[PDB]
Amino acid sequence: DMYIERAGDITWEKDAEVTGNSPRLDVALDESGDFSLV
Amino acid sequence: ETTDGVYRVMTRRLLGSTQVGVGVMQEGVFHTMWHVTKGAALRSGEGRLDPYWGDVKQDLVSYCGPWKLDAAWDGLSEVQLLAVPPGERAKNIQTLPGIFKTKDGDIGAVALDYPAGTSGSPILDKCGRVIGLYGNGVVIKNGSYVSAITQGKRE
Ligand SMILES: OCn1cnc2ccccc21
Secondary structure, three states: OEEEEEEEOOOOOOOOEEOOOOOEEEEEEOOOOOEEEO | OOOOEEEEEEEOOOOOOEEEEEEEEEOOEEEEOHHHHOOOOEEEOOEEEOEEEEEOOOOEEEEOOOOOOOOOOOOOOOEEEEEOOOOOOOEEEEEOOEEEEEOOEEEEEEOOOOOHHHOOEEEEOOOOOEEEEEOOEEEOOOOOEEEEOEOOOOO
């Protein structure tokens, strides 16, 4: 059995760390819901 | 409890307490990704949450009601991933989404890597609306992980 417990509020933080790039990827989505690269 | 917010999804079929995923509670409905729970019912203290809608191809599932989250990324602004890593505190990460280019159109994508138990963490716009869930994506050349911004359809 699975259960849930609260982890925080849904809110934007102004002092948040900024990281991560913004790649353009050609992908395909199959019937099972898995993405794959083209 | 049905309080709005972000929640961990835990199990005990394995060793100790294990976090399989994350979800958001809004308007009495719990939203997570399908691969996290596989449509199984959930426990909330003394109460119980049963699946209401789900789709394996979208990799989304909702509990107690229909999908409520309908905000969309504008395609321009940066967003924040409210990551809930297993065993660690919730932490916001701001980032500029990339693009998943498919035959059916384009969807935003976030290039942030976290343990798989973070699947279901919400992605927010600057107004604080949930524009999608994190945890269904690909692995690119370098070996890092890029997740789509997976959003459902209200009504
Ligand atoms: O960041 C969520 N996530 C879901 N599946 C993953 C696989 C590898 C790294 C991260 C993953």
